[PDB]
């Protein structure tokens, strides 16, 4: 996350931190995800497409630090790793960038809600908030494009939904963005998602509820003028999510 503020998992209790075993070389962070039910985390296919073996991956819930354990964290194995059969990346755009992980503890239980772990609601079919709406994104991604290290404490920031009309100005992304994506950015271009934040939640209030409206997917650079973050548009994937779940 570029800009925004350091937060803690209690403020984003549906955030899932996904790691890979080595191999190796022990264990390194992969990407963020979101808890959408006790047994299921949703994330982005591009995070896993290179190493698609569920046995490599660990999922933590209730965790606020990248390389240190947090009181109230729980560790999970990945029982099923489900990637989108239609994932494609062009130059910079990722299409169908959505993935499902079925989680299970060694014991072998799904998640229990607690002050650090809660599920996040999915939107109803084709329900998205209005453009201009303020949403939150969260993650352990880079704090600057040029950094080589990742923050050790979870960050969040607030970005605003942009209309498709506007995002598909050539001046923005043009044709690279599809009705299967949403755009969101800072009106002053100083806060954004960055590498390491992929798979994480774009969360909005939408008719009563904190909702998973997007998954962090792609963009040109991070926090660059007229280059918003692009998110996978969850409300256009309900059937995908229902069948594979």
């Amino acid at each position: 996350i570029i800009g925004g503020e350091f937060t803690t998992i209690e403020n984003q209790p549906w955030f899932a931190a996904i790691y890979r075993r080595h191999r190796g070389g022990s264990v390194t962070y992969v990407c963020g995800g979101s808890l959408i039910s006790p047994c299921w985390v949703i994330s982005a296919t591009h995070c896993f497409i290179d190493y698609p073996k569920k046995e490599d991956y660990i999922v933590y819930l209730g965790r606020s630090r990248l390389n240190s354990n947090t009181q109230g964290e729980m560790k999970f194995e990945v029982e099923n790793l489900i990637l989108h059969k239609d994932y494609s990346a062009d130059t910079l755009a990722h299409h169908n960038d959505i993935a499902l992980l079925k989680i299970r503890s060694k014991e072998g239980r799904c998640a229990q809600p607690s002050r650090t772990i809660q599920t996040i609601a999915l939107p109803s079919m084709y329900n998205d908030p209005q453009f201009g709406t303020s949403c939150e994104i969260t993650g352990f991604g880079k704090e600057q494009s040029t950094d080589y290290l990742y923050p050790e404490q979870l960050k969040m920031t607030v970005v605003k939904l942009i209309s498709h009309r506007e995002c598909q100005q050539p001046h923005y992304y043009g044709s690279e963005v599809t009705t299967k994506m949403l755009c969101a950015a800072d009106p002053q271009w100083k806060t954004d998602s960055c590498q390491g934040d992929s798979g994480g939640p774009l969360v909005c209030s939408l008719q009563g509820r904190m909702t998973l409206t997007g998954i962090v997917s792609w963009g040109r650079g991070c926090a660059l003028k007229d280059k918003p973050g692009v998110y996978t548009r969850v409300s256009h994937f309900l059937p995908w999510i229902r069948s594979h779940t």
Binding site: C47, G141, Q195
Partner: peptide, 16 residues
């Protein structure tokens, strides 16, 4: 695929 322990190797970034 590289060889790497690289975080989010196809994220906004980033070689791929």
């Amino acid at each position: 695929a590289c060889s790497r322990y690289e975080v989010d190797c196809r994220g906004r970034g980033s070689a791929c």
